[PDB]
Design an enzyme around this catalytic site. Sequence first.
Site, mmCIF file in Angstrom:
data_model
loop_
_atom_site.group_PDB
_atom_site.id
_atom_site.type_symbol
_atom_site.label_atom_id
_atom_site.label_comp_id
_atom_site.label_asym_id
_atom_site.label_seq_id
_atom_site.Cartn_x
_atom_site.Cartn_y
_atom_site.Cartn_z
ATOM 1 N N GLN A 35 0.854 -1.181 0.000
ATOM 2 C CA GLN A 35 0.000 0.000 0.000
ATOM 3 C C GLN A 35 0.893 1.234 0.000
ATOM 4 O O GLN A 35 1.515 1.561 1.016
ATOM 5 C CB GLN A 35 -0.941 0.006 1.202
ATOM 6 C CG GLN A 35 -2.035 1.060 1.102
ATOM 7 C CD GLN A 35 -2.731 1.313 2.421
ATOM 8 O OE1 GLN A 35 -2.118 1.238 3.484
ATOM 9 N NE2 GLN A 35 -4.023 1.616 2.360
ATOM 10 N N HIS B 116 -3.201 4.474 -1.355
ATOM 11 C CA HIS B 116 -4.003 4.955 -0.199
ATOM 12 C C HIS B 116 -4.779 6.220 -0.543
ATOM 13 O O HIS B 116 -4.413 7.279 -0.026
ATOM 14 C CB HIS B 116 -3.110 5.215 1.014
ATOM 15 C CG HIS B 116 -3.823 5.138 2.321
ATOM 16 N ND1 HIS B 116 -5.195 5.062 2.409
ATOM 17 C CD2 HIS B 116 -3.359 5.122 3.587
ATOM 18 C CE1 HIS B 116 -5.547 5.000 3.675
ATOM 19 N NE2 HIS B 116 -4.440 5.035 4.417
ATOM 20 N N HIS C 192 -8.767 7.656 4.113
ATOM 21 C CA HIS C 192 -8.390 7.930 5.524
ATOM 22 C C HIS C 192 -7.720 9.296 5.672
ATOM 23 O O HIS C 192 -6.840 9.415 6.532
ATOM 24 C CB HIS C 192 -7.548 6.768 6.057
ATOM 25 C CG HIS C 192 -8.233 5.448 5.968
ATOM 26 N ND1 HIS C 192 -7.709 4.309 6.538
ATOM 27 C CD2 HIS C 192 -9.391 5.082 5.383
ATOM 28 C CE1 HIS C 192 -8.516 3.296 6.308
ATOM 29 N NE2 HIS C 192 -9.554 3.744 5.601
ATOM 30 N N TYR D 182 -5.686 11.233 3.634
ATOM 31 C CA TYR D 182 -4.251 11.270 3.257
ATOM 32 C C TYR D 182 -4.127 12.029 1.932
ATOM 33 O O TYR D 182 -5.168 12.266 1.305
ATOM 34 C CB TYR D 182 -3.687 9.850 3.301
ATOM 35 C CG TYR D 182 -3.474 9.325 4.699
ATOM 36 C CD1 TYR D 182 -2.470 9.834 5.501
ATOM 37 C CD2 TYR D 182 -4.279 8.332 5.224
ATOM 38 C CE1 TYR D 182 -2.264 9.368 6.788
ATOM 39 C CE2 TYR D 182 -4.089 7.854 6.509
ATOM 40 C CZ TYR D 182 -3.078 8.374 7.295
ATOM 41 O OH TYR D 182 -2.881 7.912 8.562
ATOM 42 N N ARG E 108 -7.504 1.898 -2.605
ATOM 43 C CA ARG E 108 -8.411 1.866 -1.433
ATOM 44 C C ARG E 108 -9.051 3.241 -1.315
ATOM 45 O O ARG E 108 -8.315 4.233 -1.272
ATOM 46 C CB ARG E 108 -7.683 1.576 -0.121
ATOM 47 C CG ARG E 108 -8.638 1.206 1.004
ATOM 48 C CD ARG E 108 -7.971 0.834 2.307
ATOM 49 N NE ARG E 108 -8.835 -0.077 3.038
ATOM 50 C CZ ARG E 108 -8.607 -0.500 4.272
ATOM 51 N NH1 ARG E 108 -7.541 -0.080 4.926
ATOM 52 N NH2 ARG E 108 -9.448 -1.335 4.849
ATOM 53 N N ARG F 200 -8.007 -5.831 12.630
ATOM 54 C CA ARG F 200 -7.628 -6.215 13.986
ATOM 55 C C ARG F 200 -7.731 -7.720 14.203
ATOM 56 O O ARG F 200 -7.010 -8.273 15.041
ATOM 57 C CB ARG F 200 -8.491 -5.462 14.999
ATOM 58 C CG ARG F 200 -8.125 -3.993 15.129
ATOM 59 C CD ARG F 200 -9.274 -3.165 15.674
ATOM 60 N NE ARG F 200 -10.361 -3.051 14.707
ATOM 61 C CZ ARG F 200 -11.415 -2.259 14.853
ATOM 62 N NH1 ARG F 200 -11.552 -1.479 15.913
ATOM 63 N NH2 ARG F 200 -12.352 -2.247 13.908
HETATM 64 C C1 LIG Z 1 -3.465 -0.361 14.110
HETATM 65 C C2 LIG Z 1 -4.319 -0.153 12.829
HETATM 66 C C3 LIG Z 1 -3.568 0.410 11.786
HETATM 67 C C4 LIG Z 1 -4.180 0.669 10.544
HETATM 68 N N1 LIG Z 1 -3.379 1.272 9.426
HETATM 69 C C5 LIG Z 1 -3.977 1.425 8.103
HETATM 70 C C6 LIG Z 1 -3.127 1.910 6.938
HETATM 71 O O1 LIG Z 1 -1.983 2.160 7.114
HETATM 72 N N2 LIG Z 1 -3.727 2.065 5.614
HETATM 73 C C7 LIG Z 1 -5.171 1.744 5.416
HETATM 74 O O2 LIG Z 1 -5.670 1.866 4.343
HETATM 75 N N3 LIG Z 1 -5.985 1.273 6.566
HETATM 76 C C8 LIG Z 1 -5.378 1.118 7.899
HETATM 77 N N4 LIG Z 1 -6.188 0.648 9.021
HETATM 78 C C9 LIG Z 1 -7.614 0.324 8.805
HETATM 79 C C10 LIG Z 1 -7.715 -1.142 8.333
HETATM 80 O O3 LIG Z 1 -7.134 -1.277 7.076
HETATM 81 C C11 LIG Z 1 -9.176 -1.573 8.256
HETATM 82 O O4 LIG Z 1 -9.810 -0.886 7.224
HETATM 83 C C12 LIG Z 1 -9.893 -1.256 9.571
HETATM 84 O O5 LIG Z 1 -9.176 -1.798 10.641
HETATM 85 C C13 LIG Z 1 -11.289 -1.873 9.516
HETATM 86 O O6 LIG Z 1 -11.612 -2.438 10.772
HETATM 87 P P1 LIG Z 1 -11.943 -4.070 10.848
HETATM 88 O O7 LIG Z 1 -10.727 -4.802 11.361
HETATM 89 O O8 LIG Z 1 -13.109 -4.297 11.789
HETATM 90 O O9 LIG Z 1 -12.295 -4.578 9.471
HETATM 91 C C14 LIG Z 1 -5.543 0.366 10.348
HETATM 92 C C15 LIG Z 1 -6.294 -0.201 11.397
HETATM 93 C C16 LIG Z 1 -5.682 -0.459 12.633
HETATM 94 C C17 LIG Z 1 -6.569 -1.080 13.738
#
Ligand SMILES: Cc1cc2nc3c(=O)[nH]c(=O)nc-3n(C[C@H](O)[C@H](O)[C@H](O)COP(=O)(O)O)c2cc1C
Length: 362
Positions: free
Chosen positions: A98, A179, A182, A184, A231, A322
């Site tokens: 990513q 990305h 979120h 960015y 994404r 998670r």
């Molecule tokens: C510690 C943590 C770090 C994350 N870092 C990113 C990231 O760097 N880029 C991104 O697109 N989503 C990131 N996310 C979001 C996840 O990709 C995912 O969309 C999100 O956790 C959805 O929750 P779920 O586990 O219930 O599906 C992160 C989530 C967590 C919990």
Amino acid sequence: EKLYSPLKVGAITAANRIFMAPLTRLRSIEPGDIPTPLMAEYYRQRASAGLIISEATQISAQAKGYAGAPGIHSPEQIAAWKKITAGVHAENGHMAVQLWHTGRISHASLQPGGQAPVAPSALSAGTRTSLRDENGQAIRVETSMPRALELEEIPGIVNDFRQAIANAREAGFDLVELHSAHGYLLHQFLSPSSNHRTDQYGGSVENRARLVLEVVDAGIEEWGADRIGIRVSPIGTFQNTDNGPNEEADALYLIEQLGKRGIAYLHMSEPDWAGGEPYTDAFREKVRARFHGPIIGAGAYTVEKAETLIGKGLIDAVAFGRDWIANPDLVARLQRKAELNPQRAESFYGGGAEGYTDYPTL
Ligand SMILES: Cc1cc2nc3c(=O)[nH]c(=O)nc-3n(C[C@H](O)[C@H](O)[C@H](O)COP(=O)(O)O)c2cc1C
């Protein structure tokens, strides 16, 4: 069920449809933002996923917004990534990178030369980023004041994405995920609340969707559409940034543009109750009518919700976050309907092997 059947996401064929969402862990070696052999063990234990979208990787040194995030612009970085992708492929797994540009979500201490972070407009982010203290643990600090990007600097951003996509193919990745979500850089230019520009890169969905659609066109030329995925978070409020008043109308434009290019997949991050309204099946039907390729859903997903949407033809895969952090054999636990390990959220950002590679398997 269909959650355990092969799917053709781009140029590769995923073993199952239970993907691993990108998860920033802040475990890179500093200085240099180099991946570590511990990260190779981390992704190796979770190779059971059909597609592993790696943590958000910086396209350049200007994209470093979180202290501890990996990079893919240095020869030392590409060498470590090549070792990580080798381990995932040695376990019959597929891994994607990513690429992101943090943009306004950054701190001047992490930027090269102490300069202010870049952004479409000089409006602040309002959120917080992660740094490192004297002992190396992660600390939450407010984002620095960004600087408005000059139009002459925008082609430099697009070139750094193409250079990162080129290094991704050299690093042994199967696909690339951009990305555009979120809050960015690529999002900062897509949301009216973040882009008050007056140039060809602001003021209209077309002008606010050009940069991203350009990087997508740059990737299509450097590698190929089968290898480029994106994404998006078009509906909802993610990380203190919204999508303006016409979020649904502006979403279908970018989706239709990405659907005419034939990109690998479309990863849609869905909001919870606090962010916004959940994705209506009428809205999912509008997205599928414009994007005829694999769509990856993520955000408060269950096995029941994934199977129902896959049967309706609205999505083709689901991405958990998670659950993949705390369950390295998630595909095995979800098929046997076993119990999931507890999620220790205190170790999600920074630290060592604790909370990273210590989660046991069945
Ligand atoms: C510690 C943590 C770090 C994350 N870092 C990113 C990231 O760097 N880029 C991104 O697109 N989503 C990131 N996310 C979001 C996840 O990709 C995912 O969309 C999100 O956790 C959805 O929750 P779920 O586990 O219930 O599906 C992160 C989530 C967590 C919990």
